[PDB]
Structures are given as structure tokens and as C-alpha cells.
Design an enzyme around this catalytic site. Structure first.
Site, PDB file in Angstrom:
ATOM      1  N   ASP A 166      -6.641   5.032  -0.410  1.00  0.00           N
ATOM      2  CA  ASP A 166      -7.044   3.633  -0.312  1.00  0.00           C
ATOM      3  C   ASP A 166      -6.242   2.907   0.783  1.00  0.00           C
ATOM      4  OD1 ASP A 166      -7.927   1.070  -0.708  1.00  0.00           O
ATOM      5  OD2 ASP A 166      -7.211   0.914  -2.810  1.00  0.00           O
TER       6      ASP A 166
ATOM      7  N   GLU B  92      -8.388  -5.823   4.057  1.00  0.00           N
ATOM      8  CA  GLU B  92      -9.409  -5.652   3.027  1.00  0.00           C
ATOM      9  C   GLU B  92      -8.885  -6.121   1.677  1.00  0.00           C
ATOM     10  OE1 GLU B  92      -9.553  -3.390   0.286  1.00  0.00           O
ATOM     11  OE2 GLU B  92     -11.502  -4.145  -0.409  1.00  0.00           O
ATOM     12  N   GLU B  93      -7.621  -5.837   1.376  1.00  0.00           N
ATOM     13  CA  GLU B  93      -7.085  -6.086   0.041  1.00  0.00           C
ATOM     14  C   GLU B  93      -6.665  -7.538  -0.156  1.00  0.00           C
ATOM     15  OE1 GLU B  93      -7.300  -3.704  -2.147  1.00  0.00           O
ATOM     16  OE2 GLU B  93      -6.698  -1.776  -1.287  1.00  0.00           O
TER      17      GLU B  93
ATOM     18  N   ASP C 202     -14.240   4.506   1.433  1.00  0.00           N
ATOM     19  CA  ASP C 202     -13.186   3.791   0.707  1.00  0.00           C
ATOM     20  C   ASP C 202     -12.828   4.610  -0.529  1.00  0.00           C
ATOM     21  OD1 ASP C 202     -11.332   1.821  -0.083  1.00  0.00           O
ATOM     22  OD2 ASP C 202     -12.794   0.283  -0.577  1.00  0.00           O
TER      23      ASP C 202
ATOM     24  N   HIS D  68      -4.986   1.585  -7.193  1.00  0.00           N
ATOM     25  CA  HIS D  68      -4.030   0.473  -7.118  1.00  0.00           C
ATOM     26  C   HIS D  68      -2.787   0.705  -7.959  1.00  0.00           C
ATOM     27  CE1 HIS D  68      -7.060  -2.648  -5.368  1.00  0.00           C
ATOM     28  NE2 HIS D  68      -6.850  -1.596  -4.594  1.00  0.00           N
TER      29      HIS D  68
HETATM   30 ZN   LIG Z   1      -7.823  -1.037  -2.836  1.00  0.00          ZN
END
Ligand SMILES: [Zn+2]
Ligand SMILES: [Zn+2]
Ligand SMILES: [Zn+2]
Ligand SMILES: [Zn+2]
Ligand SMILES: [Zn+2]
Length: 329
Positions: A127, A169-170, A216, A298
């Protein structure tokens, strides 16, 4: 013609035969990707960090050494965040910048910001360090074929290739409409309002995006990728066919068709990710994200140790074949 934005609707692949499939399978190297493209990215790299700069430099250097005529652009912008105004930098790597149409592969190169816990740092291996490295390995493995796209007096292609590594992105703090997708929201709006090809009266860079292939959360074992959208369903079927052909030819590892990656399975819900700002403006999307998300999602355990190398190697082969067939190389 002014119907050139409709050509994507009629575009067909040029299918590779068995010999060519073996050549592509043999031409990619998971161990070389691991050492040369993936491991330098397995660092803390949230937006604005020293690691973000090191990751960007690594990505650019790995593209710049290739023979194909990649044009690198850094798209740097300011946005409000929960921690105040911050700078972000998308990375764009394009073959044939003035070609009307591009097939676009993308991922995000930032890593989610977390506090450190007991000497542990979040490096986002699935990720999305692995998707970054898969894109770099595709550029390397296919370099001699992509070199033939180069514009000379003899030939200038209608359709070429583009890579996008989104920043931010996060979420920085709490996933929300204001704290998410910083780079993709910015770049989609920018491409939507940029005439393309140069000099055009009424068409944008967004109209020239044939198809956005977004990787992703790749690298965990047993991924299943749903077929999300009716306007890319036929390209999803091509991924299924390629996986199946490579399987039957004995070119995949630790792989069964019962546990295949591309199953007859669609997904009606929304997955919020970097494709959304493109999707909402009508770009066709092939969203290569597994459902469910990997269990390490995560967590500090989304690290190198828990990656599944055979799965990545297999997906490298599938994606490289897909790209060659799409581009007719
Ligand atoms: Zn992520
Ligand atoms: Zn910008
Ligand atoms: Zn830190
Ligand atoms: Zn079969
Ligand atoms: Zn095996």
C-alpha cells in the site's frame, strides 16, 4: 478526427501467441524488481517527509535510466490538510506526450502517516510500494518494445503509455472528503481543464485517457479483483483470459484456477480510491484493488516480510501481457 475520443470504445487488443507469452514471462524478473525497484521504496514516505523526496527521486531515476523516451513531469501543488497547508507532488511519466490517446497505469507512492510504535514505522508494502515497483518493473521489462513507440519522421503513434504515481492518496488524520485523495483530486481537475492534443479547441487530456488501470493494495496472498464497471468489463475479461492462458502454459507459480485472481464476480458498491476523481468525469477505470482488503491493511504488519512474491510475479506477467496487447506491441 473529432471522433478520436470515441476510438477507445472500438479499440481491440492484438493478442499474443504462446511463444510471445513465454517470452514475456521470461523477460520479467521478480528478484531484480525486489532488490532494485521495491526495497528502496520500503521506507516512511508520507507527503512532505524526507522519505517522500527519496521515493520520488528513486522513481524518477529508475525511469530515467531506461531507453524508451519517457517524459517525466512533477505536478506540485498546495492543499489544505488537518495539519494546515502542505505541498504535494504527483509524478507523471509519459511516452509520446502529444499522442492523442494513452493507456494509463497508476498507483500512489505516499505512505499513510502514523506515529511510530516501539521502533516500528508504517512502510505500506502492499500500500502501495509493491504497485510502484510493479510499474517500474513493467517499464524495465518492456523497455525495448516501448522504445518502438518513439516518434520519428517514419512513425508517430496515435496511442501510447503513461504512468502516474499519485501523492497524498491517504488521509493524514481521518479519512474524510477534505482529508483524502489529495493528488488524484488535483491531477484529475488539472487534466480535465488542459486542452489535448496541444492546440485543441475542445478536447482535454482527460478525453485522451483510454483507460485508467489503478493498482492498489497488491502483494498479499490470494487477492480477488472484482469486475467493477460496465465500460471496462471487456478489459477485465481480457485479464481473465491472460491469467488463464499463462496458467495453462505453465508460466505462473503457486497458482490455481480455482483460486484465480480475476473471478466472475462484480461489486456494486463504491471503493473510495484515486480513480474516483477520474471515474466521476467519465474516464474508464480498471480498478486492480483486492476485495476484501488484505488483513494487514493499514497496520505495521503491511511490511516486506508479509508480501507474497509469487503472487506479485504472476501479476507482473499478467499486467505486462495486458499492456502489450492493448498497445499492439
Ligand atoms: Zn492505504
Ligand atoms: Zn498541479
Ligand atoms: Zn514518522
Ligand atoms: Zn483451462
Ligand atoms: Zn511454486
Amino acid at each position: 478526427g473529432p471522433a478520436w475520443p470515441e476510438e477507445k470504445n472500438y479499440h481491440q487488443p492484438a493478442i499474443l501467441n504462446s511463444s510471445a507469452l513465454r517470452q514475456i514471462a521470461e523477460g520479467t524478473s521478480i528478484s531484480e524488481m525486489w532488490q532494485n525497484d521495491l526495497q528502496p521504496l520500503l521506507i516512511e514516505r508520507y507527503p512532505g517527509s524526507p522519505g517522500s523526496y527519496a521515493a520520488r527521486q528513486h522513481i524518477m531515476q529508475r525511469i530515467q535510466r531506461l531507453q524508451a523516451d519517457w517524459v517525466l513531469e512533477i505536478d506540485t501543488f498546495l492543499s489544505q490538510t488537518p495539519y494546515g497547508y502542505r505541498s504535494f507532488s504527483n509524478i507523471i511519466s509519459t511516452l509520446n506526450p502529444t499522442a492523442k490517446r494513452h493507456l494509463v497505469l497508476a498507483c500512489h507512492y505516499d505512505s499513510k502517516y502514523f506515529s511510530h510504535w516501539n521502533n516500528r514505522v508504517f512502510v505500506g508494502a502492499t500500500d502501495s510500494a509493491v504497485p510502484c515497483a510493479m510499474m517500474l518493473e513493467l517499464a524495465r521489462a518492456l523497455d525495448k518494445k516501448l522504445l518502438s513507440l518513439k516518434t520519428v519522421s517514419d512513425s508517430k503513434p496515435d496511442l501510447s503509455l503513461q504512468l502516474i504515481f499519485f501523492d497524498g492518496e491517504e488521509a493524514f488524520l481521518h479519512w474524510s472528503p477534505q482529508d483524502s485523495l489529495y493528488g488524484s483530486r488535483h491531477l484529475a481537475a488539472k487534466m480535465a481543464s488542459t486542452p489535448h492534443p496541444p492546440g485543441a479547441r475542445g478536447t482535454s487530456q482527460l478525453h485522451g485517457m483510454d483507460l485508467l488501470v489503478l493498482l492498489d493494495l497488491i502483494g498479499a496472498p490470494n487477492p480477488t479483483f472484482p469486475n467493477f464497471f460496465p465500460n471496462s468489463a471487456r478489459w477485465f475479461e481480457r485479464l481473465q483470459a491472460i491469467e488463464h492462458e499463462l496458467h495453462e502454459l505453465g508460466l505462473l507459480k503457486d497458482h490455481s484456477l480455482e483460486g484465480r485472481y480475476f473471478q466472475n464476480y462484480s461489486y456494486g458498491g463504491v471503493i473510495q480510491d484515486d480513480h474516483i476523481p477520474f471515474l466521476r468525469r467519465g474516464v474508464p477505470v480498471l480498478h486492480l484493488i483486492p476485495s476484501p482488503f488484505p488483513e494487514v491493511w493499514h497496520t505495521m504488519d503491511d511490511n516486506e516480510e508479509n508480501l507474497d512474491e509469487s503472487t506479485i510475479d504472476n501479476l507482473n506477467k499478467i499486467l505486462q501481457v495486458f499492456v502489450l496487447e492493448y498497445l499492439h506491441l
